[PDB]
């Protein structure tokens, strides 16, 4: 039987490619992987199907893109999505995204079309070893950038909810730490991004504790129509 010549996967946050069906898998085949949202109330997700062996989007081949829409609005990381890749015996590729609680789904089918040459396939395979270490470093960088954005999004939500728990003075220390994280996350030093996240965490520890204290006093001792 025939096999898939290159890995098939999906773009994930940070410009990275997650492999769903590995290179050299016999066809027909189907494999799934599970994913979630990045922001509070997210109702859509972009499903960008790629082909190749390397870690960054710019180093793989873009096959197709579509969106899953109608995701129920839930806190960041709360909606559960499964994406399934199917390649039939004739090489037809179907990709389906579906959300757990409502079953909402979107799918495409992509006809086999103008191939890769055997020599371009070989070259993409060989580049993946030749740039393996650079790619490991690039993925680590990008994953730290995603973590930075994750921390910033969570702070952004907490400020939206609970700005009233901070003085303008305390709020400026936080805003300055968050602006500085946001700046260094634009560069290419992984250790610096890590230290800036740690600084945001330390500057928000009291805020996070006042938010818990508030939920606990309220649940346990009760609410006041005052505030």
């Amino acid at each position: 039987m025939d096999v898939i010549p290159l890995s098939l996967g999906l773009e994930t946050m940070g410009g990275l490619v997650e492999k769903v069906i590995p290179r050299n898998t016999t066809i027909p085949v189907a494999r799934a992987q599970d994913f979630t949202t990045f922001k509070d109330g997210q109702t859509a997700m972009s499903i960008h199907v790629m082909q190749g062996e390397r870690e960054l989007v710019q180093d793989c081949r873009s096959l197709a893109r579509f969106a899953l829409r109608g995701i129920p609005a839930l806190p960041a990381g709360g909606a559960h999505i499964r994406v399934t890749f199917q390649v039939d015996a004739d090489g037809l590729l179907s990709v389906t995204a579906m959300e757990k609680s409502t079953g909402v789904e979107a799918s495409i089918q992509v006809k086999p079309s103008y191939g890769l040459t055997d020599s371009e396939i070989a070259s993409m395979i060989k580049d993946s070893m030749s740039y393996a270490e650079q790619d490991v470093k690039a993925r680590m960088l990008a994953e730290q950038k995603v973590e930075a954005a994750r921390v910033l999004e969570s702070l952004h939500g907490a400020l939206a909810a609970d700005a009233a728990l901070l003085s303008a003075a305390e709020r400026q220390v936080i805003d300055d730490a968050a602006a500085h994280l946001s700046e260094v996350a634009q560069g290419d030093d992984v250790d610096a991004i890590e230290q800036a996240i740690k600084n945001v965490d330390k500057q928000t520890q009291d805020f996070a504790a006042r938010r818990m204290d508030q939920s606990v006093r309220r649940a346990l001792k009760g609410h006041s129509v005052d505030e």
């Binding site: 773009e11 994930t12 599970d34 994913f35 979630t36 997700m45 972009s46 960008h48 990381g77 995603v146």
Partner: peptide, 9 residues
């Protein structure tokens, strides 16, 4: 629209 985030390891 945002791409997916891995839901686990």
């Amino acid at each position: 629209e945002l791409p997916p985030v891995k839901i686990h390891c």
